From a paper:
We investigated the roles of three conserved prolines at positions 107, 226, and 258 in the β‐lactamase BlaC from Mycobacterium tuberculosis and found that mutations can lead to dimerization of the enzyme and an overall less stable protein that is prone to aggregate over time. BlaC has 15 proline residues but only these three are 97%–99% conserved among class A β‐lactamases (Armon et al., 2001; Ashkenazy et al., 2010; Berezin et al., 2004). In this study, we investigated the effects of substitutions on the structure, activity, and stability of BlaC. It was found that substitutions in all three prolines lead to an overall less stable enzyme, more prone to oligomerization and aggregation. We propose that one of the roles of conserved prolines in BlaC is to prevent protein association and maintain the monomeric state.
Pro226 is found in a loop between β‐strand 3 and an α‐helix in an α/β‐domain, interacting with Trp229, another highly conserved residue. Surprisingly, even the loop containing residue 226 displayed no changes. The absence of the pyrrolidine ring allowed for an additional ordered water to be present in a mutant structure. It is plausible that this highly conserved proline located in the loop limits protein dynamics. For Pro226 variants, T m values were about 2 degrees lower than for wild type, and for Pro258 variants, T m changes were small, indicating that both these residues are unlikely to be essential for the thermal stability.
Author numbering: 27 to 57, 59 to 83, 86 to 145, 145A, 145B, 145C, 145D, 146 to 238, ...
Write the structure that this text describes.
Amino acid sequence: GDLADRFAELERRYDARLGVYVPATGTTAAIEYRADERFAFCSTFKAPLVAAVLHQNPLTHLDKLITYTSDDIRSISPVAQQHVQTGMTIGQLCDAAIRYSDGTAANLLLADLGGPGGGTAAFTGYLRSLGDTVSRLDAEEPELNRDPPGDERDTTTPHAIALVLQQLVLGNALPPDKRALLTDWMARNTTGAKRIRAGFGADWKVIDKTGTGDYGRANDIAVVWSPTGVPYVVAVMSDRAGGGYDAEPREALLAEAATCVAGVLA
């Protein structure tokens, strides 16, 4: 069989560009499809953003209260827009950024990293520290979802983001306590049920972070565990840029790509 052919078939069926990377393991070959092509992050960056904040702070920092105003709600923020009067702690922001893809939470965590560009330069530097020489964050939410096709701003590659996530969740980029917090937030994500999760049977554990954007962008980055406890990182990125900036993102493409991956990994 030819898995690349099957991924190409999905692209034709959905009128999409699909990128996949599943890193090789001691027991499995890599799966790679358009893995070194650029795709917009969209909200997938929020997982390594949380890691960046965890990395540079003691865990007591999760209790730091962050205050903000209604004027800070500039992007879709399901949690933050209900806590303008209370504020939210850094831990609550991490939780919201991952589990509800909260954009204000993400922007506040970017600001917590500090430096020029509201934290976007700092975040890119955190990726550089993980060996990622390609990815770049140039804008805050929501502008980071809106760059035109071909613009390298706010892009990663499936290969790069998969190896970032590998290091964060399965590797030693974070100490194991911080690692566990990231993993738990991703494990309780609320936004991913129709993406990679939908391609793996219920006996597989899936943790993930979605992203969605203009030009039909729909991404999901996950770590999955087999029914025997073997983990794999699965990065699936897509866009439908040929359809214009208002092309519909297609969750089902990601679910089907995931089902193809699940077929190989079973």
